[PDB]
Every structure is written in structure tokens, then in C-alpha cells.
Amino acid sequence: KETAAAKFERQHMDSSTSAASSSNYCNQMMKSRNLTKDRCKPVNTFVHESLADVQAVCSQKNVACKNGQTNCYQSYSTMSITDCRETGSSKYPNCAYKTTQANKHIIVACEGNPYVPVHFDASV
């Protein structure tokens, strides 16, 4: 069964590119990472930093999670990310996304030993 740490890598890590390389990136990646299987995931963020750098955020500034949990951490540096947002024209199973590049601090919830991101909470 997929671990929470491996789910976070599948849903939110793309160290392969430094930024979204085209206007189709979210359409391709949302489908490729299985985020459009049973419905269109409405929003999702991909992080274009090394797995090591994103895992290190769990050692950085501790902040509250949006759901009230207190095991979230905010990256000390901005990171290259891509925000994926379903378009008004998207109809499952033909899910369609707007791709927007950003450079923002990320906030993740961390769990486990090793203590690693298991949830992407926000970017600021």
C-alpha cells in the first residue's frame, strides 16, 4: 500500500524540471500522477526542488496547519513551484488545468521517522 511519504512525492514532487516547461504541464502531470483517475483534483501544487531540500523543510520554521494541527513547517527559502487549477471548461474524464509558475515559500505537514512531508498545506 502507498505510504503517506510516497503519496506526497507522487502528488507534489517534480525535481525533474526547474519550473513548469509548458502551458500543458498541469494537464500532463495531473493525469500522469493519477490525480485525475476518479475525478479531477481541483487544485494541486508541484514543487521543483530536490527531494532533499523539500524534506529539509520539516526542520525549518514550525507553523500552524490550515486544519489546526501544529506539525506544519514553512520553507525558509522560496521554492520553484507550479500551481495547477482546474479550468471552467474541465469536464471529467477530460480534466483541464491552468498551469501557473510561482516562486513561493511552501508549508507542509510532516510525520514519521524519518520525519518527512506527508501533506502539502499551502504556499505563501
Epitope: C58, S59, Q60, K61, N62, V63, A64, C65, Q69, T70, N71, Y73, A109, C110, E111, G112, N113, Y115
Partner: nanobody
């Protein structure tokens, strides 16, 4: 990286008291939650008490509620456990934990090496 320096463990008889102390060193920000966990020989590790860096939001394990009192220096990465009315069932290694959520061990990222507490009959 960060060190959680623990002190205050010892050996006492049932009914006695002990005080555990923990200070996190080298963290540039403030751990919102810090707390105490314990692990007895053969048993699963369990949350004992936790609280937020403002001095509130205290949480206690059902078995220590009324006997143990957690405190912190407000706004600082310290946490303390006053342990009174000690029972043999409280014998365990006690661990400070920093940067986590409620008493959910897997949600805490920094752990001390542990301080042994032994309560005799």
C-alpha cells in the same frame, strides 16, 4: 541540527515526585508544541503531556491526568513535567519531543535521548 537536552530522571518509591526538564538548543524559531512521551519495557511509546508555546493548550494522557503537570517557559523551546503521586506503572524512559501535534508521536520531529524514571513498590 537541534539537540533536546533532558534532565531530572531518577529512582523513587510509589507516592514520590520527580521533575523532568527539557530545553531545545539551536532551533531558530519556536516549537509551537513540545511535550513528554514515555516508553516502558515491552510497551508501545505513549504521549504523557504536551502544551503550546503560549502557556496553554495542555493535553494529558488519561492515566497521568491529575498527577502530572506540564509547563513551558512562555515563547521558549523549553518544557517541564512535574510528576507527583508516582506509581510503579509510571516506570519508563521519558522522552522530550519538540515540533509536533497534540500527543501524536509520529507528528513530532525532534526527540531527546530519554531520561529514565523508576518508581519502586
Amino acid at each position: 541540527q537541534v539537540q533536546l537536552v533532558e534532565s531530572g530522571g531518577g529512582l523513587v518509591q510509589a507516592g514520590g515526585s520527580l521533575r523532568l526538564s527539557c530545553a531545545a538548543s539551536g532551533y531558530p524559531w519556536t516549537y509551537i508544541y513540545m511535550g513528554w512521551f514515555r516508553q516502558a519495557p515491552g510497551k508501545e511509546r505513549e504521549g504523557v503531556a504536551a502544551m503550546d508555546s503560549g502557556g496553554g493548550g495542555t493535553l494529558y494522557a488519561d492515566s497521568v491526568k491529575g498527577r502530572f503537570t506540564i509547563s513551558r517557559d512562555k515563547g521558549k523551546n523549553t518544557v517541564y513535567l512535574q510528576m507527583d503521586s508516582l506509581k510503579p506503572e509510571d516506570t519508563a524512559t521519558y522522552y522530550c519531543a519538540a515540533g509536533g501535534d497534540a500527543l501524536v508521536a509520529t507528528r513530532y520531529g525532534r526527540w531527546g535521548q530519554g531520561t529514565q524514571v523508576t518508581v519502586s513498590s
